């Protein structure tokens, strides 16, 4: 429900997260690595948004992608992941609201998010009609993602939201990216969106984006 929007809920959830098992929303790395890894390079500077206590950041490292930075607005979970992953100095963790990324522009080659925009859109009354706040907060995040990516960078989003709900959010021309989609995971009911800066949206995608902005 809408309680997933508030940091207090997450700070409460993540007490003791350094000692508890990792937890992954909408699949772990195994469920989508066939889709994800061909889009990555070992030298890529990767930013993971709303990391929580997911094993994704660690799995990227074990898979040959050491340049990982992970952020979350729960300072509790950031401290916990710093402690849990103290054996992996390559991995960086910082407390941050993803609506304002405190990095200089063009600092990353890839940005990933799994279940974070879902938190921003949690509890919407009508899945077909996005509230003013839902539109604005998601647009803020996406603008920041585009800003911190280098030219030519990639943003990859993993969510339970199917394209007839989520494409309208990603299909804004000013983000400066193309948009592709694949399904994965449980009953092929999870959705992976690939955005490549320098590409263009289709007229279909732009028409959906025009529905909210
Ligand atoms: N505005 C915001 N800024 C930064 N983190 C946010 C945020 N809104 C929600 N979050 C974080 O987003 C996460 C949503 S749950 C997804 C967790 C993790 N990426 C996984 O794949 O399992 C939580 O860890 C929550 O604290």
Q: What residue spans define the domains of the chain?
A: 1-213
* Fold (CATH) for 1-213: Rossmann fold (3.40.50)
What's the rounded Cα separation, in Å, for the pair 39 and 41? 7
Residue with tokens 């300072």, as numbered in its chain:
75
CB of 50 within 6 A of ligand 1: the answer is: yes
Q: Left if phi > 0, otherwise alpha if psi is -120 to 50, otherwise beta: which for 115?
A: left
CB of 10 within 6 A of ligand 1: the answer is: yes
Classify each residue of 106-140 as buried b or exposed e, where b means 16 or more C-beta atoms within 10 Å of its C-beta.
eebbbbbbbbbbbbbbbeeeeeeebeeebbebbbb
- Residue nearest to ligand 1 atom 23, measured at CA: 52
End-to-end Cα, the chain, rounded Å: 25
What's the rounded Cα separation, in Å, for the pair 119 and 101? 17
Residue 166 burial (CB < 10 Å; 0-12/13-18/19+)? buried
| 3-state class (DSSP) for residue 152 | strand
What's the rounded Cα separation, in Å, for the pair 158 and 205? 18
> Do residues 79 and 52 touch, judged by C-beta distance below 8 A?
no
CB of 158 within 6 A of ligand 1: the answer is: no
Residue 203 annotated as binding site: no
What's the rounded Cα separation, in Å, for the pair 23 and 83? 16
**Cα–Cα distances in angstroms (integers) from residue 11 to residues 73, 76, 80, 102, 128, in the given order:** 9, 6, 11, 21, 30
CB of 154 within 6 A of ligand 1: the answer is: no
Atom of ligand 1 nearest to the CA of 158: 21
Residue 128 annotated as binding site: no
Resolution in A for the shown PDB structure? 1.3
What's the rounded Cα separation, in Å, for the pair 195 and 152? 10
Q: Left if phi > 0, otherwise alpha if psi is -120 to 50, otherwise beta: which for 152?
A: left
Residue 10 annotated as binding site: yes
What's the rounded Cα separation, in Å, for the pair 24 and 6? 19
Residue 170 annotated as binding site: no
Residue with tokens 């193309």, as numbered in its chain:
178
């Amino acid at each position: 429900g809408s309680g997933y929007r508030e940091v207090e809920y997450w700070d409460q959830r993540y007490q003791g997260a350094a000692d508890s098992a990792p937890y992954d929303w909408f699949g772990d790395f195994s469920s989508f690595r066939a889709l994800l890894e061909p889009e990555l390079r070992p030298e890529d500077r990767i930013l993971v948004l709303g990391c929580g206590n997911s094993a994704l950041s660690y799995e990227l490292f074990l898979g040959g992608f050491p340049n990982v930075t992970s952020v979350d607005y729960s300072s509790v979970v950031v401290a916990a992941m710093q402690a849990c992953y103290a054996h992996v100095p390559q991995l960086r963790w910082e407390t941050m609201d993803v609506r304002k990324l405190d990095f200089p522009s063009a600092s990353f080659d890839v940005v990933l998010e799994k279940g974070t925009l879902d938190a921003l859109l949690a509890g919407e009354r009508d899945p077909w009609t996005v509230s003013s706040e839902g539109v604005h907060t998601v647009d803020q995040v996406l603008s920041e993602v585009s800003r911190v990516l280098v030219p030519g960078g990639r943003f990859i989003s993993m969510t339970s939201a199917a394209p007839h709900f989520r494409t309208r959010h990603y299909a804004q021309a000013y983000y400066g990216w193309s948009l592709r989609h694949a399904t994965y995971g449980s009953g092929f009911h999870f959705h992976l969106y690939l955005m490549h800066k320098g590409g263009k949206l289709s007229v279909a995608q732009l028409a959906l984006g025009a529905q909210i902005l």
